[PDB]
C-alpha cells in the first residue's frame, strides 16, 4: 500500500498551479489534464500518490556522456514510480524506460505569426532572417539534433549555432519570444492548438512533421506497468480521454 511518487512538470493546460486565496498544500496545489488523468488512474487501479515537480524542470534528454536528466532521469534512478505529464514516447527513450499505450496523439509543428508567406519547415530552413528554435532538452530538440534529414540537419545547425541563442528554457519563454520578436517556435501540435486559440495573431505553419503520442512513464520492469496501460485503454474506450481533452482545451476560439 505504498504511496507512489509521481514526477511531472509545469505545462499548460496539463499541469498548473490552482488559483485560490486559500493557501493550498499537497496535490491540491495542482490541476489540469494530467492531474485529472492521474486521478482517474488512482481510482481505476486504487493507489495513493504524491505529485513531485521534476527538480531540474526538464523533460529529459541524454547529454554527451549518455547521461539523462529531467523526468526520464527521475524514473531511471527510481526516484519516481511513474511520470504523468505531456511526456513524448520516443524510440531512444524506450531504451531506458517504459511507456503506456498513448493517452494523446500529436506531432511536431511550427508556431508563428500569421499573415506571412512562410508555409513550411523548408521555408524556415532555407532562410535565416526569421529566427527559430525549440525547448531545450526535450524530444523536439533531440528530434532535430539527431535527424538525418537534410532539411532538419540544416535547421539544427541554425538553432544550435554559436552566432546566437535560438533555444528556449521552456514553452512560455518560447511563446513570449514568438509574440515579441520575429521568431517561430517548433512545438508539439496539441499545445500549438491551445496557444493559437488564445492568441489570434498566431497560427500553425504547415502540418505535423512527425506523428507520435504521450504516454505514462514507469521504470522499466514496473509492477504497475501493465495495469496502467489497461486503465488507459478503458478510459479511451469509455470516451473519457476525449472528454478530458475537450474540458481543458475548450475556449472562445478565434474570429
Ligand atoms: N513533449 C516533449 C517536451 C516538449 C517538446 O520538446 O516538444 C516541450 C514542451 O513544449 C510545449 C508542448 C509540450 C512540451 O513538448 C517531451 O516529452 O520531451
UniProtKB/Swiss-Prot annotation:
Expressed in the olfactory bulb (at protein level). Expressed in subsets of neurons throughout the developing and adult central and peripheral nervous systems. In the CNS principally in the medial amygdaloid nuclei, medial habenulae, pyriform and cingulate cortices, and Purkinje cell layer. Also highly expressed in embryonic and adult dorsal root ganglia. Expressed at high levels in the trigeminal ganglion neurons. The modification Phosphoserine is found at residue 160. Disulfide bonds join 200-254. Residues 117-255 are extracellular. It is found in: Cell membrane; Postsynaptic cell membrane. L-glutamate binds at residues 86, 88, 93, 139-140, 188. Glycans are attached at residues 1, 201. The modification Phosphothreonine is found at residue 196. It comes from the Eukaryota. The postsynaptic actions of Glu are mediated by a variety of receptors that are named according to their selective agonists. This receptor binds domoate > kainate > L-glutamate = quisqualate > CNQX = DNQX > AMPA > dihydrokainate > NMDA. Homotetramer or heterotetramer of pore-forming glutamate receptor subunits. Tetramers may be formed by the dimerization of dimers. Can form functional heteromeric receptors with GRIK4 and GRIK5. Interacts with KLHL17. Ionotropic glutamate receptor that functions as a cation-permeable ligand-gated ion channel, gated by L-glutamate and the glutamatergic agonist kainic acid. L-glutamate acts as an excitatory neurotransmitter at many synapses in the central nervous system. Binding of the excitatory neurotransmitter L-glutamate induces a conformation change, leading to the opening of the cation channel, and thereby converts the chemical signal to an electrical impulse. The receptor then desensitizes rapidly and enters a transient inactive state, characterized by the presence of bound agonist. Belongs to the glutamate-gated ion channel (TC 1.A.10.1) family. GRIK1 subfamily. This is Glutamate receptor ionotropic, kainate 1. The chain holds residues 446 to 820 of 949 of the full protein.
